[PDB]
Nucleic acid binder design. Structure first.
Ligand SMILES: [Zn+2]
Ligand SMILES: [Zn+2]
Lengths: 151, 151
RNA sequence: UUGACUACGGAUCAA
RNA sequence: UUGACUACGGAUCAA
């Protein structure tokens, strides 16, 4: 029983809310000192905003809470591997650590298609840990799309 | 080309607004049907939001007016080559064409360090044109950082 | 520590 | 068209 696992379950809770809203089931949690400072879930379809991915929303919420665009000492937990946009957002908010669940072989940019969080040419790189509760994180997606298609 | 200068002119004017606020002088304009539907300038320091880059703000404003996260038929004009975050946001909002002024040798991800807008593995790619009013776009930055250091 | 720097220069980079 | 698909499946990909 670890914090990483604990916080990921909280991210899965966010992913479930998204599923209840009819959105792709992806959730995110941001911590500082092992204290939740922000949480979010996918709201792209609900708000019709291209940036409404879970990580992106969480990052802006944490920035407001901390009073600065620099999220120093923060850790981001997300159920799915960050896409090109979120990976870049992580770089620009300078989050030092990212823990994610399932990999995204189709659009993942934190290890799959590329790792934008580990670029020597960027002014910031982040520690990247994957697999945390990936089975459960992955199940939410496959279930969602199964139903999406059936319907 | 002349149309491009017209809109980049408005992006520079927007960039100057950011300058007056003490922000890195970058501005953006989004058009649809040859009409301006959104404009914005850098607000990172003012709002203390890591996502407050000009094109990112313009994209969310564009999405709001269109009531859709898909920016079909839109053209983005920005005074500086989009960074990793903005390039990714451009991909996630599915903008068909991007026109930028000055190149960013240090962080540009639309041709310089890489081109996230021409990724074979992504579900979206855009036409990228560079150099429009390159000189004017570049000067703003050169001046900003010269004064910043002296400051 | 000095220098460089095109998204602050609180980052990064070179000695 | 027809299928596949892990950020809608309005995209992309494959025949
Ligand atoms: Zn994302
Ligand atoms: Zn940017």
């Amino acid at each position: 029983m670890t914090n990483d696992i604990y916080f990921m379950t909280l991210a899965i809770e966010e992913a479930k809310k998204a599923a209840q809203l009819g959105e792709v089931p992806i959730g995110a949690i941001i911590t500082k000192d092992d204290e939740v400072i922000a949480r979010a879930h996918n709201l792209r379809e609900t708000l019709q905003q291209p940036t409404a991915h879970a990580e992106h929303i969480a990052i802006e919420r944490a920035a407001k809470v901390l009073g600065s665009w620099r999220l120093e000492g923060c850790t981001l937990y997300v159920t799915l591997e960050p896409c090109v946009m979120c990976a870049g957002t992580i770089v620009m908010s300078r989050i030092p650590r990212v823990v994610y669940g399932a990999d995204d072989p189709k659009g993942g940019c934190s290890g799959s298609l590329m790792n934008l969080l580990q670029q020597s040419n960027f002014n910031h790189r982040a520690i990247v840990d994957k697999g945390v509760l990936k089975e459960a994180c992955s199940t939410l997606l496959t279930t969602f799309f199964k139903n999406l298609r059936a319907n």
